[PDB]
């Protein structure tokens, strides 16, 4: 019951400013210091400051001092990161965690979920979903396979959840491909028991927060 | 700033085998006054946030395996997994605490090597529904296999195509330690309709010849 | 010499 979640991936114009929140739960919000982290796209972790979440005081990593501000709402146990006059280089995930609580008997480290932030000049659009949907040619063995092709979307990330979540064994969402067209593509996947297709329900849930998309596609056989 | 570097950026080691990583830091993170080492050590898998393993540079995180084990001292530092497992596939980041501003290391990917298998290969003719927009997809799914090299060649009417296909592979797995991977021919409506036959051929190290999987448009 | 404001978390 003690976890840290953000708020969802968001799109962003060059220029501009994006707030990311940190919703705390399961112990004393005020005891512990906020730190945010940034994470670019293949690369290492970028620590960006922190926050006491009692005193509300920061420090600020120099890299960031001039457009980073970090805040906390004691009532909603809550802590903000905002960072403006955004460029394309700042996209990256930006995770807020309690790092390294060390005290003489316990050590206490909890990271949130991440929030991706994609700062771009392009135009945002929401994907196309297809059933791929099990047939002959996708079954052997025993095993079928089906899923769901998530196609022509902007920016990252898509997420998809098989029957919201209640199905997760042999699930493969593969990484976006960058079509010419300078949209995402990408394909999610599972295997299944050819002889349950007359008798299970495979939905996959798509979701796109940065264009508010949201598609359940139920994938039947042929 | 204290400068992290790890060693190396990558490896590859066996079920069961000892996997090491290293990691220099610019300056000693050894505080005199108490002799200790403000340095630990995270764990990321896959789309997951880091998760903490070592502090003091040698102290395991409640929950950590025992198999996990840190050492080092002053300037220089190493990760120890004693017997990998299966899980255990992810990026490990260096990570100092004793000035500002908190640095990370470039972080080490660590592969398992398991044995050899061969992949599974599916293929998905393109939806009615896409075909009403005016685009076909054609996916062939490669599931299950190590190692991660492998060959997708399409053929449309036993010709061989170049430059209209993408192809994607997964990270590895968690449980079986293998990558999928999936090969995505992209054709308009009216190109999909001059063709018959449509077909993905294999190759892979556990694979003695290619294997095919093909469908006959309408079918 | 330490800096002890690096991470408040740090006892």
Same mark, same amino acid.
């Given at each position: 019951? @003690?976890? /840290?979640?953000?708020?969802?991936?968001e799109?962003?114009?060059?220029?501009?400013? @994006?707030? @990311?929140s940190?919703? %705390?739960?399961?112990?004393?919000?005020?005891?512990?210091?906020?730190?945010?982290?940034?994470?670019?796209?293949?690369?290492?972790?970028?620590?960006?400051?922190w926050?006491?979440?009692?005193?509300?005081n920061?420090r +600020?990593s120099?890299?960031?001092?001039?457009?980073?501000?970090?805040?906390?709402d004691?009532?909603?146990?809550?802590?903000?990161m905002? /960072?403006?006059?955004?460029?394309?280089?700042?996209? %990256?995930?930006?995770?807020?965690? /309690?790092?390294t609580? /060390?005290?003489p008997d316990?050590?206490?480290?909890?990271w949130?979920?991440?929030?991706?932030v994609?700062?771009?000049?392009?135009?945002?659009?929401?994907?196309? @979903?297809?059933?791929? %949907?099990?047939?002959?040619?996708?079954?052997?063995?025993?095993?079928?396979?089906?899923?769901?092709?998530?196609?022509?979307?902007?920016?990252?990330?898509?997420?998809?959840?098989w029957?919201?979540?209640?199905?997760?064994?042999?699930?493969?969402?593969?990484?976006?491909?960058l079509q010419?067209?300078?949209?995402?593509?990408?394909?999610?996947?599972?295997?299944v028991?050819?002889?349950?297709?007359?008798?299970?329900? +495979?939905?996959?849930?798509?979701?796109?927060?940065?264009?508010?998309?949201?598609?359940?596609?139920?994938?039947?056989?042929? | 700033?204290?400068?992290?570097?790890?060693?190396?950026?990558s490896?590859?080691?066996?079920?069961?085998?000892?996997?090491?990583?290293?990691?220099?830091?610019?300056?000693?993170?050894?505080?005199?006054?108490?002799?200790?080492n403000?340095?630990?050590?995270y764990?990321?898998?896959?789309?997951?946030?880091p998760?903490?393993?070592?502090?003091?540079?040698?102290?395991?995180q409640?929950?950590?395996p025992?198999?996990?084990?840190?050492?080092?001292?002053?300037?220089?530092?190493?990760?120890?997994?004693?017997?990998?497992?299966?899980?255990?596939?992810?990026?490990?980041?260096?990570?100092?605490?004793?000035?500002?501003?908190?640095?990370?290391?470039?972080?080490?990917?660590?592969?398992?090597?398991?044995?050899v298998?061969?992949?599974?290969?599916?293929?998905? !003719? !393109?939806?009615?529904?896409?075909?009403?927009?005016?685009?076909?997809?054609?996916?062939?799914?490669?599931?299950?296999?190590y190692?991660?090299?492998?060959?997708?060649?399409?053929?449309?009417?036993?010709?061989?195509?170049?430059?209209?296909?993408?192809?994607?592979?997964?990270?590895?797995?968690?449980?079986?330690?293998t990558?999928?991977?999936?090969?995505?021919?992209?054709?308009?409506?009216?190109?999909?309709?001059?063709?018959?036959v449509?077909?993905?051929?294999?190759?892979?190290?556990?694979?003695?010849?290619?294997?095919?999987?093909?469908?006959?448009?309408?079918? | 010499?330490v800096?002890?404001?690096?991470?408040?978390?740090?006892?």
């Open positions: 019951q @003690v976890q /840290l979640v953000q708020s969802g991936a799109v962003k114009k060059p220029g501009a400013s @994006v707030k @990311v940190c919703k %705390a739960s399961g112990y004393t919000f005020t005891s512990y210091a906020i730190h945010w982290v940034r994470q670019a796209p293949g690369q290492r972790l970028e620590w960006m400051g926050i006491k979440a009692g005193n509300g920061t +600020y120099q890299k960031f001092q001039d457009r980073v501000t970090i805040t906390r004691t009532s909603t146990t809550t802590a903000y905002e /960072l403006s006059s955004l460029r394309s280089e700042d996209t %990256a995930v930006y995770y807020c965690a /309690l790092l609580v /060390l005290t316990d050590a206490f480290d909890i949130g979920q991440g929030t991706m994609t700062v771009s000049s392009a135009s945002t659009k929401g994907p196309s @979903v297809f059933p791929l %949907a099990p047939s002959s040619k996708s079954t052997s063995g025993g095993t079928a396979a089906l899923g769901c092709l998530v196609k022509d979307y902007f920016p990252e990330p898509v997420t998809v959840s029957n919201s979540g209640a199905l997760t064994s042999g699930v493969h969402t593969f990484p976006a491909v010419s067209s300078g949209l995402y593509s990408l394909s999610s996947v599972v295997t028991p050819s002889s349950s297709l007359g008798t299970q329900t +495979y939905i996959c849930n798509v979701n796109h927060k940065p264009s508010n998309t949201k598609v359940d596609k139920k994938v039947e056989p042929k | 700033d204290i400068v992290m570097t790890q060693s190396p950026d490896l590859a080691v066996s079920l069961g085998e000892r996997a090491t990583i290293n990691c220099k830091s610019s300056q000693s993170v050894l505080y005199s006054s108490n002799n200790k403000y340095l630990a050590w764990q990321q898998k896959p789309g997951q946030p998760n903490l393993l070592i502090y003091w540079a040698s102290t395991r409640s929950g950590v025992d198999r996990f084990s840190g050492s080092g001292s002053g300037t220089d530092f190493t990760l120890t997994i004693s017997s990998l497992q299966a899980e255990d596939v992810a990026v490990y980041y260096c990570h100092q605490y004793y000035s500002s501003p908190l640095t990370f290391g470039g972080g080490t990917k660590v592969e398992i090597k398991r044995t298998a061969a992949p599974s290969v599916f293929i998905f !003719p !393109p939806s009615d529904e896409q075909l009403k927009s005016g685009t076909a997809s054609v996916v062939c799914l490669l599931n299950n296999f190692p991660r090299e492998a060959k997708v060649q399409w053929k449309v009417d036993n010709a061989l195509q170049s430059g209209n296909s993408q192809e994607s592979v997964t990270e590895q797995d968690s449980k079986d330690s990558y999928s991977l999936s090969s995505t021919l992209t054709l308009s409506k009216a190109d999909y309709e001059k063709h018959k449509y077909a993905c051929e294999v190759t892979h190290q556990g694979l003695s010849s290619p294997v095919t999987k093909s469908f006959n448009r309408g079918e | 010499n800096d002890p404001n690096a991470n408040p978390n740090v006892d």
